[PDB]
Amino acid sequence: ANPVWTALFDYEPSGQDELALRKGDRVEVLSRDAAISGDEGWWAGQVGGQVGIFPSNYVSRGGGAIRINPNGTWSRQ
Amino acid sequence: PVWTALFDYEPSGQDELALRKGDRVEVLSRDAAISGDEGWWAGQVGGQVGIFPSNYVSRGGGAIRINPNGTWSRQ
């Protein structure tokens, strides 16, 4: 498998290659690295049988109970 | 205005800023003048000005965060 991230917010595609997200969706992340530099920040993922690109700032790892701090420690929320 | 880096990012181009998760980023422009550069923002990290992907930051460095769907949260 690939890592599974969770959508934080709804996202509505603006084009046909973009993946629609709704809050709480589990997204399998297939690539975090755009081939074209102008697309950096968009990740490829799969949800619901569909594969497309989505903005990385709409997803998180898990549900929020554990936080990774800037200094690399973990905390409970 | 202060933003926070969401992810580590290692740059691979000229003028691009290194990000580490949790960095404070001061955003200078949210709008590339050229169409090829749309999606990249200009800002300053650690005293250095350069560009970075917009989607690798979130707004706010204190108790209130602004999400990209236009909502606000307590951090």
Numbering used by the authors:
A (entry chain A): 42 to 118
B (entry chain B): 44 to 118
Which of the paper's sentences describe this entry?
MLK3, also known as MAP3K11, is a serine/threonine protein kinase involved in regulating the JNK, p38, and ERK pathways. It is composed of several modules: an SH3 domain, a kinase domain, tandem leucine zippers, a Cdc42/Rac interactive binding (CRIB) motif, several linker regions, and a proline-rich C-terminal tail. The SH3 domain has been implicated in the autoinhibition of the kinase domain through an intramolecular interaction via a nonconsensus single proline motif located between the leucine zipper and CRIB motif in the full-length MLK3 protein. The overall structure reveals a five-stranded antiparallel β-barrel, a characteristic of all known SH3 domains, and three loops (RT, n-Src, and 310 helix), commonly involved in the recognition of both proline-rich and nonproline ligands.
The newly identified binding surface is composed of an extended n-Src loop (located between β2 and β3 strands) of the MLK3 SH3 domain, which opens up to bind a peptide ligand, named “MLK3 SH3–interacting peptide” (MIP), which lacks the canonical PXXP motif. To determine the structure of the MLK3 SH3–MIP complex, we constructed a fusion protein MLK3 SH3(41–105)-MIP(1′–19′) where the prime denotes residues of the peptide. The structure of MLK3 SH3(41–105)-MIP(1′–19′) was solved to 1.2-Å resolution and refined to an Rwork/Rfree of 13.6%/15.8%. The interaction of the SH3 domain of MLK3 with MIP occurs between two protomers that are related by crystallographic symmetry. The MIP binds in a pocket formed between the n-Src loop and β-strands 2–4. Most notably, several hydrogen bonds contact Trp-10′ in the MIP sequence. The backbone amide group of Trp-10′ interacts with Asp-74, and the carbonyl group interacts with the backbone amide of Ala-76. The Trp-10′ indole nitrogen atom hydrogen bonds with the carbonyl group of Trp-83 located on the edge of β3 strand. Gly-8′ and Arg-12′ also contribute to hydrogen bonding; the carbonyl group of Gly-8′ interacts with the hydroxyl group of Ser-72 in the SH3 domain, and the guanidine moiety of Arg-12′ forms a salt bridge with the side-chain carboxylate of Asp-80. To accommodate MIP the n-Src loop undergoes a dramatic conformational change.
